[PDB]
Amino acid sequence: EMELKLIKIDTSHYFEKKPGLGERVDYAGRCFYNKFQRVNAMLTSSLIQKHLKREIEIAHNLILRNDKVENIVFDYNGRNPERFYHKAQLLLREEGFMNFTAYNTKTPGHLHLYVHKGHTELGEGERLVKTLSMKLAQGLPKEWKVFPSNEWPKEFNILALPYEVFAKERGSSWAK
Numbered sequence: 465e466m467e468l469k470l471i472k473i474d475t476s477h478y479f480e481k482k483p484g485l486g487e488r489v490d491y492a493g494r495c496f497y498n499k500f501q502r503v504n505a506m507l508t509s510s511l512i513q514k515h516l517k518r519e520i521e522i523a524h525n526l527i528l529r530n531d532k533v534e535n536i537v538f539d540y541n542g543r544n545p546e547r548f549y550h551k552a553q554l555l556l557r558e559e560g561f562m563n564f565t566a567y568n569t570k571t572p573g574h575l576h577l578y579v580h581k582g583h584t585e586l587g588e589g590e591r592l593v594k595t596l597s598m599k600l601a602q603g604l605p606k607e608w609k610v611f612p613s614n615e616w617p618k619e620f621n622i623l624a625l626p627y628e629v630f631a632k633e634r635g636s637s638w639a640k
């Protein structure tokens with residue numbers, strides 16, 4: 465199971481997955497089909513339970529007002545989450561990140577790994593997560609996407625609510 469965990473989800477609005485298809489979006493010379501509809505109403509406790517029951521499929525917006533993000537995220541889409549998570553956690557602690565949480569997503573094997581950085585300017589967070597992704601791809605075949613990213617439209621920087629906690633690490637360091 466899992467109760468309520470602090471990704472510091474923005475609850476002012478949410479995104480609902482719709483059947484289809486998806487609405488065409490052109491972005492940076494490329495085509496996207498958007499299968500999620502923004503809902504301009506609060507993400508309530510009621511709605512999350514419905515999501516956990518799989519009666520609905522809701523996503524929260526990674527990008528906060530003033531283009532800040534609270535988390536950078538690895539979206540792992542492979543079938544070896546334990547191997548992925550092991551190499552990711554070694555990389556993270558080493559690059560200074562000791563606070564992160566991996567959650568199970570809808571497809572067995574898949575995860576979202578949130579790195580609990582704190583409010584970060586959007587561009588900087590895009591860059592930092594890309595750089596980590598590159599470092600990680602040296603030691604593992606790339607079967608993840610990273611968030612936030614400018615590779616897709618701003619509204620595709622959303623994450624389906626997590627279903628279960630896969631793993632979690634916490635810590636603090638002090639030198640000199």
Ligand SMILES: Nc1nc2c(ncn2[C@H]2C[C@H](O)[C@@H](COP(=O)(O)OP(=O)(O)OP(=O)(O)O)O2)c(=O)[nH]1
Pocket residue numbers: 486497498499500523539540541569570571572574575619620621622623624625
């Ligand atoms: N706005 C928008 N966001 C999307 C769309 N497709 C995916 N996303 C966002 C929400 C998803 O949680 C996130 C990662 O996409 P994935 O296809 O890996 O889905 P997800 O991780 O939720 O499930 P899974 O890997 O299948 O366990 O990307 C879309 O068509 N429109």
